[PDB]
RNA sequence: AGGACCGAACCGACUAAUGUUGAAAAAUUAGCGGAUGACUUGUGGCUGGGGGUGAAAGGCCAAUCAAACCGGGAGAUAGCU
RNA sequence: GCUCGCCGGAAGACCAAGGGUUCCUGUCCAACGUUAAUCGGGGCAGGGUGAGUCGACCCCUAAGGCGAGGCCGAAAGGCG
RNA sequence: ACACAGGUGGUCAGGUAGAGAAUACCAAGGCGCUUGAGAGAACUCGGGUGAAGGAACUAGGCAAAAUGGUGCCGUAACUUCGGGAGAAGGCACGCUGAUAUGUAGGUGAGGUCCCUCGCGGAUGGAGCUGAAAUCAGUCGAAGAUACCAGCUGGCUGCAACU
RNA sequence: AAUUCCUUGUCGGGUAAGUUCCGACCUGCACGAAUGGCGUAAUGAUGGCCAGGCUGUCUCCACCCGAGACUCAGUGAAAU
RNA sequence: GCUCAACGGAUAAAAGGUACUCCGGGGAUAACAGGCUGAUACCGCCCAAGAGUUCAUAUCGACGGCGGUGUUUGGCACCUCGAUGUCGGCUCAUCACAUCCUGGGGCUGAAGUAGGUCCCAAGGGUAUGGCUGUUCGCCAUUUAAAGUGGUACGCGAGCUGGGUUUAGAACGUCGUGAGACAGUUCGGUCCCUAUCUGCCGUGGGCGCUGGAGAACUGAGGGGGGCUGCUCCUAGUACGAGAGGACCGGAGUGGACGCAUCACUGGUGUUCGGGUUGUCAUGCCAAUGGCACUGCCCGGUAGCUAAAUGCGGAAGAGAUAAGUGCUGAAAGCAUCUAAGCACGAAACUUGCCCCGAGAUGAGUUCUCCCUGACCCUUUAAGGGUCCUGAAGGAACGUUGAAGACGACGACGUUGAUAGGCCGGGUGUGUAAGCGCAGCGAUGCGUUGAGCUAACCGGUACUAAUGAACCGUGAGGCUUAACCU
């Protein structure tokens, strides 16, 4: 049984979610507000900001580290020069979820995943 | 796996009695656009508690 | 933890290097014997001319099991052979009269006394 | 040199699990046998229902076999439901 | 459009078989499509198949078919 | 009879390993197979791992696990002299440096000689390519590391075998 | 013995134990010499038996990752 | 003239095989299982020649007699042929008692020990292997015990198909042959989503007559009960010796169950590392993808058992067989007729669980509503307005609760999850730099770097102001204190 455990499975195989999760961690940080269901969205969560808190404190190996998590030299570069220093102050939480109803072919019930800033 | 006899429609209403759909109990309003938006939902304008989100 | 169709080590001089169980002593549907079981073996390999041959039937005592005895203080004391001392079916005492390798502490009393004298360390 | 050996194409189909109103009215996945020979294969032509063909199981001859398929005698006959 | 994946002696690139507009260009979503459907190999309409040298006929045959006369069967016909 | 995990003859053949049209990843090229989004029960299909024991399971080692390549030493009864035989069992294998700043070998340009002559014949060795072995040295728990890639032996019944 | 009913015939190895197996006896119900006798190197997706290697076959089943089965959305059968 | 002799006489004339088979029928008619007798089978009784040193009765019982059970072998052909799958294994049982163990009593040709044999007792428990297709059987080996039976000789809409059973093939034997033969080896497709009754779980509506939040009393029900051995008494009694207890006590183990994970381990394709082959990130380094996590080594929390804690009780009541006390019938003996006492794992309790849909619908301490009216339904009736509180449902964050429901915690007064800092834990000196060297590589910063769920923390993100449902003194009769 699933007692005290942690993860979600969603349907894919884990050769599938984690290369599910680099596309979409490489959107997030791209546009800064995604239109995405809800429990990818819910854990995208955890995805995307571990690697903007050890974004925080910059580094050579950081510059690796991260090239590991993402695979692109864009977003490394993005993630360490501006959506780094914008959120230095606080402990966590870049993301915010807001329902947005359901979806048209397939009843998915979406969300849109957003940062904290945009104004 | 094979049924012996052809049953009847109250048995067929009695097995369709839990079928009871309802709908919304009631919607919510905004404070700064003001329609009748889902429970922690946004509009369809892209109204939430105040925000205007896109 | 033996149990029936287990091939064993014998640990004393009586000429048997290798035997197999064939039944557990003392309850019914018994499945596991650790120290202190007297077990019921056949013997499998003699050397050229020992105390006993090939094909007899005495019980035994396992002496020394992989699976390990465990201590009170929850630590537990493993090996790395199933090996046993063998016995005799009249007498409940062995056969043979140097044991080489070690046994245990926990088969000390005064039914088998005689295998913790003979035995170069006492674990 | 081989009616030789291990082995892909190619041909065949030994065992087990799936499935037996399934993807298929006989297949699929992991294993198997032969694999320069009495082999395998594309084209065309030949044989014909008491007759054809058979390295022989009454096998196969248009998803049909101890006598095929279609029309006719024929609305065959039935002490049996 | 750009991240990810799968075949790469195939599920890549062509022809003889067989099918017979399924090909391209506009337009439509009622049935067809195992769902949605603006998309289509679907409905309608319009265009699209250029040879002295490349494939068929063509000169010549192999198996085998027909076969003037001819021989033999009741007619059908059977061989040649 | 289905926009069917079925079947159907010929032509072309890239890289890095590799004996090779096997196999593992790929480029040229093509597709994600016309329903989905979730929760992480019994049970079933397809699979990876397992402490002690190791066929006690059962009609039966059925299934599963295991072996598995190249080189060298070695190899029994039996026999139709071929076979048995890859009998059985073992030993070394990664990378680095030297022998040799790339050797034995393969290929072969200039240079020169006659010339029965042309698309020459020889001496000639530049340059390119490149095994295999021995000796030191080094990392891991493990060097055929992944994919492919024989389980072996002992007496019989039947049939020569393919 | 692929043929043997009384039968698990009788003895010996193999096993702690062996109605099957291998070796002898002959009292062969009812083998037997080209519907063939006995024998035999190699070979068989062949019948029967023991041994080493190997392990969920099992004593005793525990966990894990995937395609279903359970919920919500669209299409929507069949035996009786 | 016709042994037409099958003698009312079908022809002047006639034999077999089908497991390669096909059709119409048939429960008129076989096998499987039922139903009916109960001849055989089994188990209790009656007479009692004898056997047993004496002696029918401790244990056996001749020649004979009568029933029970339905249990083998059989008899009849009723249901069943427009079909109910058959033996044995595997998996799950439940009852019967003619009881294998264990519990209590009487007899003995019973000194003790161990037994013989009937009588009461069915709560609980009941071998792993070799061999054949096999229940059985034989054999090896334990245990307290390896019970006997029905349930379609239980169970193929639950599972093997080896046996007998289809098509092929052969040997013996039979027939001239086609082919047969409880004779034999060899290979031989076991189909199905549950409509209903049933059973284990989880739920919504309504009733419980004012409505809601909880905690409970328990009439009934349901799992539970097992046993070994060693040690004390005591080497006591008994016994010539040899042997060797009753009755009570103390400990430790197996089978079966209940939980939980701290210890020992198992898994741990979400956490570290090594490693091959190949292509890309322009490249060297560095990291990622694919080949069962590519092959492996380790491994947190959770899930798990082989891992370790607990259970089976003790007691009370009336009881079955049996021993009694007092004592007439029958002046005496008499457990019995009056009465009184004992008696075992069976019985009711005692241990524990779901337990007021117990309609015989409960008990029980709490919190909320104390407005106006008109209409014919003349009062338990219909409607317009301020009233809409107790409390629950719905929505979002979710969980050591979970198929979906349901149960539980939190909802800006607040840690319910995800985040984050400090830690822990797992792996094992990351990259980068400088030195050494021909280079693989080591050494220093360095037990460094990364870190899944894990224990104590932080309002940065997500849990919205409300709205929705539930109403306004509770019906009637009869009894009792009181103004
Ligand atoms: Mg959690
Ligand atoms: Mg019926
Ligand atoms: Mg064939
Ligand atoms: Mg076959
Ligand atoms: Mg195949
Ligand atoms: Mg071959
Ligand atoms: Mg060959
Ligand atoms: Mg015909
Ligand atoms: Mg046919
Ligand atoms: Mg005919
Ligand atoms: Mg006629
Ligand atoms: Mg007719
Ligand atoms: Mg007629
Ligand atoms: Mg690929
Ligand atoms: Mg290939
Ligand atoms: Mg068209
Ligand atoms: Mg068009
Ligand atoms: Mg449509
Ligand atoms: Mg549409
Ligand atoms: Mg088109
Ligand atoms: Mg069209
Ligand atoms: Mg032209
Ligand atoms: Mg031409
Ligand atoms: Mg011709
Ligand atoms: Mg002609
Ligand atoms: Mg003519
Ligand atoms: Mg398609
Ligand atoms: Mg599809
Ligand atoms: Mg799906
Ligand atoms: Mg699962
Ligand atoms: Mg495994
Ligand atoms: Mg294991
Ligand atoms: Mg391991
Ligand atoms: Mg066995
Ligand atoms: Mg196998
Ligand atoms: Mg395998
Ligand atoms: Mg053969
Ligand atoms: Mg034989
Ligand atoms: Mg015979
Ligand atoms: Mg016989
Ligand atoms: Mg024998
Ligand atoms: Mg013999
Ligand atoms: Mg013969
Ligand atoms: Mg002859
Ligand atoms: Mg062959
Ligand atoms: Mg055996
Ligand atoms: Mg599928
Ligand atoms: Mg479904
Ligand atoms: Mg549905
Ligand atoms: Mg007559
Ligand atoms: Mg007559
Ligand atoms: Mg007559
Ligand atoms: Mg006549
Ligand atoms: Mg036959
Ligand atoms: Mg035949
Ligand atoms: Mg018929
Ligand atoms: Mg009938
Ligand atoms: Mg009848
Ligand atoms: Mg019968
Ligand atoms: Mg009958
Ligand atoms: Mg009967
Ligand atoms: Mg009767
Ligand atoms: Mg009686
Ligand atoms: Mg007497
Ligand atoms: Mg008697
Ligand atoms: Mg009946
Ligand atoms: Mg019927
Ligand atoms: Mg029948
Ligand atoms: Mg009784
Ligand atoms: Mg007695
Ligand atoms: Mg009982
Ligand atoms: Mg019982
Ligand atoms: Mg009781
Ligand atoms: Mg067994
Ligand atoms: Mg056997
Ligand atoms: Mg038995
Ligand atoms: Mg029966
Ligand atoms: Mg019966
Ligand atoms: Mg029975
Ligand atoms: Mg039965
Ligand atoms: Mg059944
Ligand atoms: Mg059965
Ligand atoms: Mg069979
Ligand atoms: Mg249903
Ligand atoms: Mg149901
Ligand atoms: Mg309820
Ligand atoms: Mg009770
Ligand atoms: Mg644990
Ligand atoms: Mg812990
Ligand atoms: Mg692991
Ligand atoms: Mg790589
Ligand atoms: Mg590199
Ligand atoms: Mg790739
Ligand atoms: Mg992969
Ligand atoms: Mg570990
Ligand atoms: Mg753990
Ligand atoms: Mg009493
Ligand atoms: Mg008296
Ligand atoms: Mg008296
Ligand atoms: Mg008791
Ligand atoms: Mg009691
Ligand atoms: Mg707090
Ligand atoms: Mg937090
Ligand atoms: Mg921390
Ligand atoms: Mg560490
Ligand atoms: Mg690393
Ligand atoms: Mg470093
Ligand atoms: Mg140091
Ligand atoms: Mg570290
Ligand atoms: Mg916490």
Redesign the pocket.
């Known amino acids: 049984?699933?007692?005290?455990?942690?993860?979600?499975?969603?349907?894919?195989?884990?050769?599938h979610?984690?290369?599910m999760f680099?596309?979409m961690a490489?959107s997030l940080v791209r546009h800064e507000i995604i239109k995405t269901?809800?429990?990818?969205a819910?854990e995208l969560?955890?995805v995307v900001?571990?690697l903007i808190?050890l974004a925080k404190t910059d580094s050579?190996?950081n510059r690796?580290?991260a090239?590991?998590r993402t695979?692109?030299?864009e977003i490394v570069a993005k993630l360490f020069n501006e959506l780094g220093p914008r959120f230095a102050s606080?402990?966590?939480?870049?993301?915010?979820?807001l329902?947005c109803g359901f979806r048209?072919?397939?009843?998915?019930?979406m969300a849109y995943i957003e940062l904290?800033d945009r104004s | 796996?094979?049924?012996?006899?052809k049953?009847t429609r109250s048995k067929r209403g009695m097995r369709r009695s839990?079928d009871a759909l309802t709908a919304?109990?009631?919607l919510?309003?905004?404070?700064t656009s003001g329609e009748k938006?889902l429970?922690?939902?946004i509009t369809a304008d892209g109204y939430?508690?105040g925000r205007k989100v896109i | 933890?033996?149990?029936?169709?287990?091939?064993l080590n014998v640990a004393d001089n009586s000429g048997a290097r290798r035997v197999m169980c064939?039944?557990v002593?003392?309850?019914?549907?018994?499945?596991?014997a650790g120290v202190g079981d007297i077990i019921?073996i056949?013997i499998?390999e003699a050397i050229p001319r020992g105390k006993v041959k090939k094909?007899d039937?005495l019980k035994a005592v396992v002496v020394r099991?992989?699976?390990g005895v465990?201590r009170p203080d929850?630590?537990?004391i493993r090996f790395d052979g199933?090996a046993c001392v063998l016995l005799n079916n009249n007498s409940e005492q062995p056969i043979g009269t140097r044991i080489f390798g070690p046994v245990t502490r926990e088969l000390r009393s005064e039914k088998f006394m005689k295998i913790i004298s003979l035995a170069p360390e006492v674990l």
């Open positions: 049984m699933r007692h005290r455990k942690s993860g979600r499975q969603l349907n894919r195989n884990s050769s979610r984690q290369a680099r596309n490489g269901t809800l429990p990818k819910k969560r955890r900001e571990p808190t050579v190996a690796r580290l090239f590991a695979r692109d030299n606080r402990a966590g939480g870049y993301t915010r979820i329902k048209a072919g397939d009843n998915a019930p904290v | 796996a094979v049924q012996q006899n049953p839990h919304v109990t009631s919510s309003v905004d404070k938006h429970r922690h939902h939430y508690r | 933890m033996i149990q029936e169709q287990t091939m064939i039944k002593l003392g309850g019914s549907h018994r499945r596991y019921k056949t499998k094909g039937v099991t992989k699976k465990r929850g630590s537990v199933n």
